[PDB]
Tab-separated table of C-alpha atoms in Angstrom:
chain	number	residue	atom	x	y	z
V	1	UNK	CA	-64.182	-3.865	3.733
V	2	UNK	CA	-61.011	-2.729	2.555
V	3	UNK	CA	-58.646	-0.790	4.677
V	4	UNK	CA	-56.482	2.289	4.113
V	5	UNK	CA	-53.777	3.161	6.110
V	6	UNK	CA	-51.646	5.857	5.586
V	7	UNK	CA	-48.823	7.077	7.604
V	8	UNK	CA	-47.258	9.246	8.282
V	9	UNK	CA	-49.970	10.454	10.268
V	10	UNK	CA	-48.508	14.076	10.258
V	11	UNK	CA	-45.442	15.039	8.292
V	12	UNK	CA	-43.690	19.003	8.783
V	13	UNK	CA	-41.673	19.899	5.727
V	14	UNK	CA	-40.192	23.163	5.498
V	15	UNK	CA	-40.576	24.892	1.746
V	16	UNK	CA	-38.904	23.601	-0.769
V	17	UNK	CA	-38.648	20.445	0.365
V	18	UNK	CA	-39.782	17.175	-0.739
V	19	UNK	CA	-42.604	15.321	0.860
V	20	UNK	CA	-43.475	11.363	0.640
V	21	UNK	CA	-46.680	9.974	2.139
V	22	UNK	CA	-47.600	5.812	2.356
V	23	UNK	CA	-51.062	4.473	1.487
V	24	UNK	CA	-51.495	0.821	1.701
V	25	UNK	CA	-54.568	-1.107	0.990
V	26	UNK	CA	-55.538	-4.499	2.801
V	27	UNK	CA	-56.489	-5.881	-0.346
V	28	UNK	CA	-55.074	-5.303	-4.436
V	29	UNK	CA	-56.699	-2.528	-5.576
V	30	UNK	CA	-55.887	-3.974	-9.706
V	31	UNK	CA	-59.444	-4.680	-11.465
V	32	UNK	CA	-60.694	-6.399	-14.309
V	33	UNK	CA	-59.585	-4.424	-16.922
V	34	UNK	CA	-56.153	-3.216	-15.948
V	35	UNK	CA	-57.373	-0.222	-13.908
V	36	UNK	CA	-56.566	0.528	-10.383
V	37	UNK	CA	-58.933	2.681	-8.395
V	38	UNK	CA	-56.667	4.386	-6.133
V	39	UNK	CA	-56.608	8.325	-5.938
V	40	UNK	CA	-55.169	10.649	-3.599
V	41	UNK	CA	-56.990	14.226	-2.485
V	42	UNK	CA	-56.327	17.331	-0.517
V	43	UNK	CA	-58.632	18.935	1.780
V	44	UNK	CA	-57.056	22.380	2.493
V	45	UNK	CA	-58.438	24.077	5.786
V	46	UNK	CA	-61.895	25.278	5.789
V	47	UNK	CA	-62.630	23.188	2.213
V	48	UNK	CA	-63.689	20.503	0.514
V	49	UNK	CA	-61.357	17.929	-0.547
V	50	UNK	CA	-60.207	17.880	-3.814
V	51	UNK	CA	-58.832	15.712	-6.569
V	52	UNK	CA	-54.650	15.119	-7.101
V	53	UNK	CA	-54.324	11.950	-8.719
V	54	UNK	CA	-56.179	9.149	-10.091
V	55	UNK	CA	-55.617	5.695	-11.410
V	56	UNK	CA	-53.006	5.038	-9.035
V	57	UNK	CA	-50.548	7.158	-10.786
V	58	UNK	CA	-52.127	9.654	-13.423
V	59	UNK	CA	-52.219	13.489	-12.879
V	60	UNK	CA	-56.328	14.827	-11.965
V	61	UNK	CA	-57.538	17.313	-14.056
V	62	UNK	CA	-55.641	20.694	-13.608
V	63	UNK	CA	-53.547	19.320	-10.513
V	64	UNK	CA	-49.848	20.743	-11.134
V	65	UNK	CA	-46.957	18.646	-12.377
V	66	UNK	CA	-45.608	18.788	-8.157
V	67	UNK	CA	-47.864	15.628	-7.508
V	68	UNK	CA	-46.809	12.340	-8.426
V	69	UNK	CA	-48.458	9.123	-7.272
V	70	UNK	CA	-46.491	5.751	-7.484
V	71	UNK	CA	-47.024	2.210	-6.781
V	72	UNK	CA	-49.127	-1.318	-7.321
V	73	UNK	CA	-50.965	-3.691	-5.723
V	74	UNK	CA	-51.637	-3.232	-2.164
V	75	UNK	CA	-48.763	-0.325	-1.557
V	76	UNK	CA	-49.259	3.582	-2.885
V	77	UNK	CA	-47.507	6.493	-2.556
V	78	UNK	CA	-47.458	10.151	-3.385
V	79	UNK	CA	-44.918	12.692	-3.784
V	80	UNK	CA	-44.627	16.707	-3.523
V	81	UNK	CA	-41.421	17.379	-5.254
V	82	UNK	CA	-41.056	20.987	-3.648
V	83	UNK	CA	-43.621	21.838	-1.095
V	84	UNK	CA	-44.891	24.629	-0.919
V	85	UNK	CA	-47.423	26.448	1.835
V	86	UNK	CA	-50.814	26.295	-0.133
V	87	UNK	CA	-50.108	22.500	-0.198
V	88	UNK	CA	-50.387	22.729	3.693
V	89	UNK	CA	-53.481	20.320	4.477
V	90	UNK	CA	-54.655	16.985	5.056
V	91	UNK	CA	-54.150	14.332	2.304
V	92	UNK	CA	-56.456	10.905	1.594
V	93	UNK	CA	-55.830	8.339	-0.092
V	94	UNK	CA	-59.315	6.450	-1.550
V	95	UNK	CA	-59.922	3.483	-2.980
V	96	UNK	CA	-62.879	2.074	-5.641
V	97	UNK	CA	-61.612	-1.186	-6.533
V	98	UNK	CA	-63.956	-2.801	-3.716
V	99	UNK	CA	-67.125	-2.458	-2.580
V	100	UNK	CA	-68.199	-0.408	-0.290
V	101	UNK	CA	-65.444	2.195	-1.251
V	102	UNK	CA	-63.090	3.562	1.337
V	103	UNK	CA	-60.899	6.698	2.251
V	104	UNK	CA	-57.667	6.028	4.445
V	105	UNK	CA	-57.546	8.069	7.692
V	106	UNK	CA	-55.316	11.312	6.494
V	107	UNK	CA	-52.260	12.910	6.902
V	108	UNK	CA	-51.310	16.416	7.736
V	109	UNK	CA	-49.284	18.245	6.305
V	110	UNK	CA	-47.468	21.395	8.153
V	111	UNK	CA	-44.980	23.485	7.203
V	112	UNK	CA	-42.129	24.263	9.014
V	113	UNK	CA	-41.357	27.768	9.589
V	114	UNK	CA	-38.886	29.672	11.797
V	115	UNK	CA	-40.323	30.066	15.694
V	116	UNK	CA	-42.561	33.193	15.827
V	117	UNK	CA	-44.134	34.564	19.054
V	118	UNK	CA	-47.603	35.617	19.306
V	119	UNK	CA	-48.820	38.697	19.419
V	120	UNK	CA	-51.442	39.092	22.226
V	121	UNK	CA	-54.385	41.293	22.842
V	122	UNK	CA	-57.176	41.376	25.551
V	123	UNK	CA	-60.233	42.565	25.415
V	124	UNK	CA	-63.029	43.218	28.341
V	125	UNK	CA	-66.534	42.659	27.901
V	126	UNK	CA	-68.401	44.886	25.890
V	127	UNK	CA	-71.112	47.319	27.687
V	128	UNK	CA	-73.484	45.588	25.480
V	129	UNK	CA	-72.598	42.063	26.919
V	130	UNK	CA	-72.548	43.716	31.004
V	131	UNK	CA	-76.488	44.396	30.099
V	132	UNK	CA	-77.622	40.703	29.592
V	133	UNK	CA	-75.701	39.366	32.842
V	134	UNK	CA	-72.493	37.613	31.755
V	135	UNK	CA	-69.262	39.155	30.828
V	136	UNK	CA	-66.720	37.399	28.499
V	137	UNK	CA	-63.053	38.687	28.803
V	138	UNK	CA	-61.196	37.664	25.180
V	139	UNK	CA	-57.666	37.388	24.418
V	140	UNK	CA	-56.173	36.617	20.961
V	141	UNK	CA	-52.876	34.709	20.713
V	142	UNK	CA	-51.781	35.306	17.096
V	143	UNK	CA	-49.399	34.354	14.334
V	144	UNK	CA	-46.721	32.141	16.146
V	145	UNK	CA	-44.953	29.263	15.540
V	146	UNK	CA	-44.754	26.702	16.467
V	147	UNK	CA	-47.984	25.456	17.252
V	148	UNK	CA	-47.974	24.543	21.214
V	149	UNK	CA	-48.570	27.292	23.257
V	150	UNK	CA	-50.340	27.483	26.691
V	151	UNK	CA	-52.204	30.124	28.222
V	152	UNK	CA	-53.080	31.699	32.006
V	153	UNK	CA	-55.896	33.728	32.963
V	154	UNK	CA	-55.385	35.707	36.385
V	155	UNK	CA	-58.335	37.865	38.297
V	156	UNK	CA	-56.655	40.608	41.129
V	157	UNK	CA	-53.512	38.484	40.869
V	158	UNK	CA	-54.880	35.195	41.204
V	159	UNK	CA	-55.337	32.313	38.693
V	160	UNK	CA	-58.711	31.304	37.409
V	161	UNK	CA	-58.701	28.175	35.765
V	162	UNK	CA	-62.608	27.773	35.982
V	163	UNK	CA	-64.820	29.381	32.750
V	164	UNK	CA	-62.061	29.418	29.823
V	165	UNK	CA	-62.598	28.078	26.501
V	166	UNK	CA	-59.937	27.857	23.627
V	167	UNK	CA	-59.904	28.181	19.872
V	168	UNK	CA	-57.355	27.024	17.764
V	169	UNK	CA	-56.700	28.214	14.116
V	170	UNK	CA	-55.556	25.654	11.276
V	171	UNK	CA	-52.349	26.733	9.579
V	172	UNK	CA	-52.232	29.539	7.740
V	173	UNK	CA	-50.497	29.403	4.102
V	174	UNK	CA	-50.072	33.238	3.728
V	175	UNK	CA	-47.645	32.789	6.605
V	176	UNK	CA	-47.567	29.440	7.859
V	177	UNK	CA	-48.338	30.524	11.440
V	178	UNK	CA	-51.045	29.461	14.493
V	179	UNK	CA	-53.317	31.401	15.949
V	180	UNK	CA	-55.657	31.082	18.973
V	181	UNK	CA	-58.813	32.575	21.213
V	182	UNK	CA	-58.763	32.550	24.613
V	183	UNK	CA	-61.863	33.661	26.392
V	184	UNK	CA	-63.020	33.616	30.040
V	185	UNK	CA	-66.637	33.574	30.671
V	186	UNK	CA	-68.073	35.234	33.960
V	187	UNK	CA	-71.635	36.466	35.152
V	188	UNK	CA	-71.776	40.309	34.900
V	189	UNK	CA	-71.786	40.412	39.035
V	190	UNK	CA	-68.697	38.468	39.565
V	191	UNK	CA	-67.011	40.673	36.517
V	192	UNK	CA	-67.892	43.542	38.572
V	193	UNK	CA	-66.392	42.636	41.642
V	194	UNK	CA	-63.267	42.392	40.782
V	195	UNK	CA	-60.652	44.845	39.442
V	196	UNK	CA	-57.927	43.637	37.138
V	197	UNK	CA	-57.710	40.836	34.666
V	198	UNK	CA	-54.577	39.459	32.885
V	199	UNK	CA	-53.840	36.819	30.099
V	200	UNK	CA	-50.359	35.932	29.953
V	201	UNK	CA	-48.821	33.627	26.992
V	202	UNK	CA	-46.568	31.241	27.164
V	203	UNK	CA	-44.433	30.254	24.301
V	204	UNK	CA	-41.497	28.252	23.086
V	205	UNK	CA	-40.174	31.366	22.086
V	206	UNK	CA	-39.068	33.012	25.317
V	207	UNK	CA	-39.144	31.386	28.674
V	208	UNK	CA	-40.527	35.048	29.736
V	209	UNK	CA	-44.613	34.851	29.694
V	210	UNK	CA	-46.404	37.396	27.306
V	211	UNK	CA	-48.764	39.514	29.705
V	212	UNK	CA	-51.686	41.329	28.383
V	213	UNK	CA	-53.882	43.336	31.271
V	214	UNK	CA	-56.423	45.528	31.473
V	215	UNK	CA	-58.265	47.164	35.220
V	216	UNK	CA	-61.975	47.331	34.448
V	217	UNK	CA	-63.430	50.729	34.229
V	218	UNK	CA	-60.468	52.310	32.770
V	219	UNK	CA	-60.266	52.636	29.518
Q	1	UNK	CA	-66.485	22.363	-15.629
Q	2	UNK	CA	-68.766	20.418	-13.188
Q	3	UNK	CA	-69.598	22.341	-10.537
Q	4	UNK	CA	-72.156	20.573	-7.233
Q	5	UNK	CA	-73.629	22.469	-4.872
Q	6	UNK	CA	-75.658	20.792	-2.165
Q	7	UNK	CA	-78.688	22.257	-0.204
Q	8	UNK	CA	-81.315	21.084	2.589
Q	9	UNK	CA	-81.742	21.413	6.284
Q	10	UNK	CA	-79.134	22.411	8.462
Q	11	UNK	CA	-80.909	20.888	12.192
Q	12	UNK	CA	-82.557	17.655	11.964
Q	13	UNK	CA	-84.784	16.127	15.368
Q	14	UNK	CA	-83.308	12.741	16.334
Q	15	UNK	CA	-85.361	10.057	14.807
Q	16	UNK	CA	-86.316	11.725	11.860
Q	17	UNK	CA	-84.763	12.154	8.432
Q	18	UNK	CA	-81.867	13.977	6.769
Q	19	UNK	CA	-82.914	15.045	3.385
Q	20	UNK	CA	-80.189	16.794	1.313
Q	21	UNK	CA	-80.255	18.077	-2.367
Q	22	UNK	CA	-77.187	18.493	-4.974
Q	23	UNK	CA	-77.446	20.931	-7.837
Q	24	UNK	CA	-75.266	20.124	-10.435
Q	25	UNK	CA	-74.372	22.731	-13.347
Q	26	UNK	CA	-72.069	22.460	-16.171
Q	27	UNK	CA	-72.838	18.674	-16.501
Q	28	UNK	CA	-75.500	16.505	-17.429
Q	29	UNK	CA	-76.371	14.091	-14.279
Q	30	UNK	CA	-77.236	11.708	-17.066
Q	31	UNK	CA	-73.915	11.422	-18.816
Q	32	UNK	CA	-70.378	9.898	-17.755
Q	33	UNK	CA	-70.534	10.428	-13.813
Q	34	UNK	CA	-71.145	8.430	-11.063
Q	35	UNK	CA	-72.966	10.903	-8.020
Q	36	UNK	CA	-71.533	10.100	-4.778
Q	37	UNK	CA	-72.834	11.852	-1.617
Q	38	UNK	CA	-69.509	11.432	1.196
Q	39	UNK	CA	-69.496	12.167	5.058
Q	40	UNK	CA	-66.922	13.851	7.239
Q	41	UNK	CA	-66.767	13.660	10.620
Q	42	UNK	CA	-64.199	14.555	13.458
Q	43	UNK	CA	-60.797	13.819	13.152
Q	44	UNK	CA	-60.519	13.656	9.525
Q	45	UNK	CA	-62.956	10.335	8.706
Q	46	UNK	CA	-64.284	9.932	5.640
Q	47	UNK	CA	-67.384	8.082	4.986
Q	48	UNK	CA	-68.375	6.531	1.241
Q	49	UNK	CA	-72.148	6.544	1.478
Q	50	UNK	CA	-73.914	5.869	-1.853
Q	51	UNK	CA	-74.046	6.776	-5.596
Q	52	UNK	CA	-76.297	6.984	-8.211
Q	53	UNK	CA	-75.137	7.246	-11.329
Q	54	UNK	CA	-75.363	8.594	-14.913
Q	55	UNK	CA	-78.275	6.140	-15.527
Q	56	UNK	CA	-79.785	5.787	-12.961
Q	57	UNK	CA	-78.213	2.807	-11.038
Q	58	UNK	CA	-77.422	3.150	-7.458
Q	59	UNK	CA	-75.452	1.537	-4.777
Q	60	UNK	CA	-74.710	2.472	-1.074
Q	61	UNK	CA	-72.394	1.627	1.719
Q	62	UNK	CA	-74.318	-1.272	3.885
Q	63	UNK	CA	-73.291	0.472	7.262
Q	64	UNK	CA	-76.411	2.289	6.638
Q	65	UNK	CA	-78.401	-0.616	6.338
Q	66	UNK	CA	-81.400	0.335	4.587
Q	67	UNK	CA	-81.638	3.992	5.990
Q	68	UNK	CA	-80.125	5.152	2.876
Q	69	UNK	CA	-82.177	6.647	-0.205
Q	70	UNK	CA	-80.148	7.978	-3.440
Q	71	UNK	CA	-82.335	9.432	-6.103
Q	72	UNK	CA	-82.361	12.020	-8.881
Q	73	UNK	CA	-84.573	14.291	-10.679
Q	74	UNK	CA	-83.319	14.501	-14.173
Q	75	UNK	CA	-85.871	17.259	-15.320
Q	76	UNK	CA	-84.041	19.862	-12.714
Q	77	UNK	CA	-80.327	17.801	-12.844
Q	78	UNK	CA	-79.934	17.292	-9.066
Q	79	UNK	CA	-79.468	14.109	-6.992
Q	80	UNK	CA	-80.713	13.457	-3.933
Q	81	UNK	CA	-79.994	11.921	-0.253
Q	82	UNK	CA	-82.605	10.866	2.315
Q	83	UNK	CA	-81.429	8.876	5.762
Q	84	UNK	CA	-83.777	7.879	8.086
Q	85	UNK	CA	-83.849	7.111	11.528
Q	86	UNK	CA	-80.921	9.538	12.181
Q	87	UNK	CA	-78.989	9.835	15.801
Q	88	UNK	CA	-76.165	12.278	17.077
Q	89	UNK	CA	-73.981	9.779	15.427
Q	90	UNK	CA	-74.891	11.249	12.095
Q	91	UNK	CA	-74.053	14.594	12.659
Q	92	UNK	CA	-71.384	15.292	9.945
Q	93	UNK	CA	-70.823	17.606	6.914
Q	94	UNK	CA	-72.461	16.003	3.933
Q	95	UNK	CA	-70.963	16.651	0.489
Q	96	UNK	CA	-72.037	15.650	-2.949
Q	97	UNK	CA	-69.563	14.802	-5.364
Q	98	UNK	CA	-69.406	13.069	-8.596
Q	99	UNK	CA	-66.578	10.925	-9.887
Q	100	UNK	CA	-66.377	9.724	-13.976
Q	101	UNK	CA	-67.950	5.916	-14.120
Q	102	UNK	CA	-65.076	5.029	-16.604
Q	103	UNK	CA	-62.211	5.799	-14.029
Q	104	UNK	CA	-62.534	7.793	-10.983
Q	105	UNK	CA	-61.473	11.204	-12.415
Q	106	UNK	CA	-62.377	14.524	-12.631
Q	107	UNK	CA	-63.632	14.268	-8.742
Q	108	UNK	CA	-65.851	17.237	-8.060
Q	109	UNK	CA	-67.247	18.015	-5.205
Q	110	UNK	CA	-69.431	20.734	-3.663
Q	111	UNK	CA	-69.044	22.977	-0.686
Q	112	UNK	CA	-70.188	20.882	1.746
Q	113	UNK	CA	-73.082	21.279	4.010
Q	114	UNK	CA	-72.993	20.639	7.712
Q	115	UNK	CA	-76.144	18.126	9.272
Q	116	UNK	CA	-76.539	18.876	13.117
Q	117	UNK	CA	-78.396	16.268	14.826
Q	118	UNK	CA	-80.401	17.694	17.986
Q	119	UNK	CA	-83.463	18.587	19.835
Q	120	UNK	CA	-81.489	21.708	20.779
Q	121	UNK	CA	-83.438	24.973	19.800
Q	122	UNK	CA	-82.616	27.258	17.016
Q	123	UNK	CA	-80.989	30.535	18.912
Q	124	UNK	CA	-79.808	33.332	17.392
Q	125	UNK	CA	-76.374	34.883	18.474
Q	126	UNK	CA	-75.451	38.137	20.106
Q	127	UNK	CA	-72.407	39.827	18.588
Q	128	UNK	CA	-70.418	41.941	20.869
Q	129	UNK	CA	-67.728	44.169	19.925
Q	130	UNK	CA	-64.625	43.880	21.140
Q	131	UNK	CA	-62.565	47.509	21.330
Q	132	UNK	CA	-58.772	47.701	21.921
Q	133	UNK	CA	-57.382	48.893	25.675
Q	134	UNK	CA	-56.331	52.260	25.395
Q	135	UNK	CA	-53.160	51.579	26.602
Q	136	UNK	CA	-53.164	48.967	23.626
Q	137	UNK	CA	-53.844	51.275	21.056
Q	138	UNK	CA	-50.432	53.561	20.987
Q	139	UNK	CA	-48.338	50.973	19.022
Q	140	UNK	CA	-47.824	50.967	15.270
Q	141	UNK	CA	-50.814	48.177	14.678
Q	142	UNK	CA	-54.403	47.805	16.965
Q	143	UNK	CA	-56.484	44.873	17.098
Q	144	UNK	CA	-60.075	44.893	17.547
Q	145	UNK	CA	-62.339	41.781	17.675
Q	146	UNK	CA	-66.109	40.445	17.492
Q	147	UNK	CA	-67.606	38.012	19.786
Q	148	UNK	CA	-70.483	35.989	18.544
Q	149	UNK	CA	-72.392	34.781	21.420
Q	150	UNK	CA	-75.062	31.633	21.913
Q	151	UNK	CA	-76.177	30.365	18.963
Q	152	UNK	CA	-77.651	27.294	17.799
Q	153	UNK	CA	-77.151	25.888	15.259
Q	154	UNK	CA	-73.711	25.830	12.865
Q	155	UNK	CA	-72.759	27.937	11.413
Q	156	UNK	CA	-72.577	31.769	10.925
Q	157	UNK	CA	-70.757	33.418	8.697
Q	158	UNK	CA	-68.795	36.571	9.475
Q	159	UNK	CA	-66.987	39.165	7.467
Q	160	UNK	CA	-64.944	42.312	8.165
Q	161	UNK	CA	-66.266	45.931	6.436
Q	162	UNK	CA	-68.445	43.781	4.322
Q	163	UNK	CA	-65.806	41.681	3.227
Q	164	UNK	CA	-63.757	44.428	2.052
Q	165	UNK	CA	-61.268	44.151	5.248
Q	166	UNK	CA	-60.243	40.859	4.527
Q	167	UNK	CA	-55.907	40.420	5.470
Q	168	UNK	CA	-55.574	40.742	9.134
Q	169	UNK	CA	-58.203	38.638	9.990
Q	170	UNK	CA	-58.612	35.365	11.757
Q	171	UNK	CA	-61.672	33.974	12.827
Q	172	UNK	CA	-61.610	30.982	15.021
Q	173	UNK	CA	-63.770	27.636	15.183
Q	174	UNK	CA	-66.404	28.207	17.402
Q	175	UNK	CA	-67.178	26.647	21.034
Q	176	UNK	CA	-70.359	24.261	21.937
Q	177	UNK	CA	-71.123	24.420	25.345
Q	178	UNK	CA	-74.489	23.554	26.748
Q	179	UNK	CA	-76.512	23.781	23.312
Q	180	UNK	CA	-75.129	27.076	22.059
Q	181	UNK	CA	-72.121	27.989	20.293
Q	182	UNK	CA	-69.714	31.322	21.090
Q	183	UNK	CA	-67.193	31.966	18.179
Q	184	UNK	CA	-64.914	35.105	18.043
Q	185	UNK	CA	-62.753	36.703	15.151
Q	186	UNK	CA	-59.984	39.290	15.528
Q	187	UNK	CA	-58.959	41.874	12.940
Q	188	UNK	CA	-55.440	43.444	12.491
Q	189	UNK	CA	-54.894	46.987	10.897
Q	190	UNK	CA	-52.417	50.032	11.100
Q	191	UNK	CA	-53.033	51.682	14.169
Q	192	UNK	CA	-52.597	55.187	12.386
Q	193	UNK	CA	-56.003	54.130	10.484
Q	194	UNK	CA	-58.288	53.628	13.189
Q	195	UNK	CA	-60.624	54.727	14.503
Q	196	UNK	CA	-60.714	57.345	11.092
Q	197	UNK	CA	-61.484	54.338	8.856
Q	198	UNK	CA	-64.467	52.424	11.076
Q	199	UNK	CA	-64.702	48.495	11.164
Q	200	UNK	CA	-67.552	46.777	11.252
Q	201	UNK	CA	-67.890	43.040	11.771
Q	202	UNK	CA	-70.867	41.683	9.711
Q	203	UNK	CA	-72.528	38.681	11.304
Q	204	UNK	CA	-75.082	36.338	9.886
Q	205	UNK	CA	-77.172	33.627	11.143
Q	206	UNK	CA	-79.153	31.748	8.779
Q	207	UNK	CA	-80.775	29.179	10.711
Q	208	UNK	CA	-82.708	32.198	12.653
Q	209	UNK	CA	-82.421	34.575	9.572
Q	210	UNK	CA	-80.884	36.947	11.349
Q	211	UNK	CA	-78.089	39.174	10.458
Q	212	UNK	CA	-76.101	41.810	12.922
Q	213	UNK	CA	-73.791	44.640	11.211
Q	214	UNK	CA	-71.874	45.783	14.437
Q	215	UNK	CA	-69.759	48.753	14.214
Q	216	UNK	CA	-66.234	48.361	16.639
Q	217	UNK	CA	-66.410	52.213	18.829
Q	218	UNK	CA	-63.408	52.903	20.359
Q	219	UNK	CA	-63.522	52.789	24.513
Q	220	UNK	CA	-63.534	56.400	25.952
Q	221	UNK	CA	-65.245	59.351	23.770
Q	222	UNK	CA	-66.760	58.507	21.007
C-alpha cells in the first residue's frame, strides 16, 4: 500500500499568516489518463472532514480561493495564503491513484494567539449526586492560552492526587482559546468527612497558582 | 447538493456484525459517484474501507479480508455496510461519503456515526447540576455547569435553554472509566441575569431513550 506522510505534524500560525503543509506519497500518484488522485481535506473539531482540493491542484467545490495545492509525482503541498481561525483543524492529504486508497496521518493546525489565563470555577456536588453515594467536585479551567496548563486538587489543605479525571477542549475559532474539566470523584462518606476543597490552576501566565475553594455546607 | 446521512446501531456485541445504512438525498446513488464508507479512529487515522459505486461495482480495502459487505438498495437510494466478526479494534466513527468516479471531487460526506464495540450494558446517565459558590456569584459574570454521570454508550447530546443559550458554553469530551462515561459542560452568562433568567441544561441519551431537562437552582433559598 501506498504511504502518506505529511509533516509538519502540527503547525501554529498566528492570523494572517501564511501556512505550508508537505504530503508525500511512497509511490507517483500520475494515472493513465493524465489525472492525479491526490486531494487534501479539513476536519474542523467536532466534524466531518471535508473537501479543499482535488486533482492534485484544482479548487473543491465551494472551497475559497485561500487554498492552493501544488506539486507532482510523489511530493504535494498545500497552502493557506492568510490563515484565518475557522481554518483551525486537522488537514489530510488522500490519495486514489492506488489500490487500496489511503489518507496520510494529519496535521494540526493551531492558531497562535496572545497568552490568556483561565478563568476558574468550582463546583461541589450536587444534593442530588450526595443521595446515590458518590460526590463529584468539578472545576472548569476556561479560555486560556496557551494550551498547557496543569492542575491541583487539595482536601483540608492536603493534595489528593487519587480520583481526578481531565477534559480537554479542541481549539476554539470564536477565540482561539483552550478550555478544560477537572473533576474529583469521591464516595458521598468520604465527601462528608472532610471540610474544604480547593482547585488551584497553574498557568504560563503567572507563576502565581489560580485558587478556586469552596467549605462544604456553606453556600 | 449531495447530502449522506448514515444510520444503524450505535453498540455492537463482540463477534457479531456492524451493520450501517447511508441515506443519500439530492443525488442519484446510480449516477456519477463512487460510495465510499471511511473509518476514524484515535489520533487522527483514517481508514479507506470499500465503495460501491454508481453501478453497482464494488471494491474494498483487503485489511478486512472478507468481513466486508458493500451493497445498495436503489429503490430507497441508500448504500450499505455490513462487517462481521467485529472486535474492540473496530470501534471507530463510521462515515459514508461519496466521491465523483470521473475524478475524486465533490467529496461529500455525512455526519458520521460512532460504532462502540462491547459487552458493556446500555446505562443511562444521571445529570447533576452544578450551581455557582456564593461567594462566586458577586462578580460581573457566573458560571454554572451540568454533570452527566455513568452512561453507556456514546454519545449524548446536550444543549443549554433548549439550545437557545448557545455562546458561553463549552462542553467537554467525556471520560470512560470502568464501562460508563461522565461528561460535563459549563455555561457562561452576565451575572446580573441570573438567577432571573433560569438555565436549564437539556440532556439526551438515545441509546436508553432517555432524556433529562435539569433546571440549574441557585445554592441557598430558592
Amino acid at each position: 500500500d501506498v504511504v502518506m506522510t505529511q509533516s509538519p505534524k502540527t503547525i501554529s500560525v498566528t492570523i494572517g499568516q501564511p501556512a505550508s503543509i508537505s504530503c508525500k506519497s511512497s509511490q507517483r500518484l500520475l494515472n493513465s489518463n493524465g489525472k492525479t488522485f491526490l486531494n487534501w481535506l479539513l476536519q474542523r473539531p467536532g466534524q466531518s472532514p471535508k473537501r479543499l482540493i482535488y486533482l492534485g491542484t484544482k479548487l473543491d467545490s465551494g472551497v475559497p480561493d485561500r487554498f492552493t495545492g501544488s506539486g507532482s509525482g510523489t511530493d504535494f503541498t498545500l497552502k493557506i495564503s492568510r490563515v484565518e481561525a475557522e481554518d483551525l483543524g486537522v488537514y489530510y492529504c488522500w490519495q486514489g491513484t492506488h489500490f487500496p486508497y489511503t489518507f496520510g496521518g494529519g496535521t494540526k493546525l493551531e492558531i497562535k494567539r496572545a497568552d490568556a489565563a483561565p478563568t476558574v470555577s468550582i463546583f461541589p456536588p450536587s444534593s442530588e449526586q450526595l443521595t446515590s453515594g458518590g460526590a463529584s467536585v468539578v472545576c472548569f479551567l476556561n479560555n486560556f492560552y496557551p494550551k498547557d496548563i496543569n492542575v491541583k486538587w487539595k482536601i483540608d489543605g492536603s493534595e489528593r492526587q487519587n480520583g481526578v479525571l481531565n477534559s480537554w477542549t479542541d481549539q476554539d475559532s470564536k477565540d482561539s482559546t483552550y478550555s478544560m474539566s477537572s473533576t474529583l470523584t469521591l464516595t458521598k462518606d468520604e465527601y462528608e468527612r472532610h471540610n474544604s476543597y480547593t482547585c488551584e490552576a497553574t498557568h504560563k501566565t503567572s507563576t502565581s497558582p489560580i485558587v478556586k475553594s469552596f467549605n462544604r455546607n456553606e453556600c | 447538493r449531495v447530502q449522506l446521512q448514515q444510520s444503524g446501531p450505535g453498540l455492537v456485541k463482540p463477534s457479531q456484525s456492524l451493520s450501517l445504512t447511508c441515506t443519500v438525498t439530492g443525488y442519484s446513488i446510480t449516477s456519477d459517484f463512487a460510495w465510499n464508507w471511511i473509518r476514524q479512529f484515535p489520533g487522527n487515522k483514517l481508514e479507506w474501507m470499500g465503495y460501491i459505486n454508481y453501478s453497482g461495482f464494488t471494491s474494498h480495502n483487503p485489511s478486512l479480508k472478507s468481513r466486508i459487505s458493500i451493497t445498495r438498495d436503489t429503490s430507497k437510494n441508500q448504500f450499505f455496510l455490513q462487517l462481521n466478526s467485529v472486535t474492540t479494534e473496530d470501534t471507530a466513527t463510521y462515515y459514508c461519503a461519496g466521491l465523483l468516479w470521473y475524478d475524486g471531487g465533490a467529496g461529500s460526506w455525512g455526519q458520521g456515526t460512532l460504532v462502540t464495540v462491547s459487552a458493556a450494558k446500555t446505562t443511562a446517565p444521571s445529570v447533576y447540576p452544578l450551581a455557582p459558590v456564593c461567594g462566586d456569584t458577586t462578580g460581573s459574570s457566573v458560571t454554572l455547569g451540568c454533570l452527566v454521570k455513568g452512561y453507556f454508550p456514546e454519545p449524548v447530546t446536550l444543549t443549554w435553554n433548549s439550545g437557545s443559550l448557545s455562546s458561553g458554553v463549552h462542553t467537554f469530551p467525556a471520560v470512560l472509566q470502568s464501562d460508563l462515561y461522565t461528561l460535563s459542560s459549563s455555561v457562561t452568562v452576565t451575572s446580573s441575569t441570573w438567577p432571573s433568567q433560569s438555565i436549564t441544561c437539556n440532556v439526551a441519551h438515545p441509546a436508553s431513550s432517555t432524556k433529562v431537562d435539569k433546571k440549574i437552582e441557585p445554592r441557598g433559598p430558592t
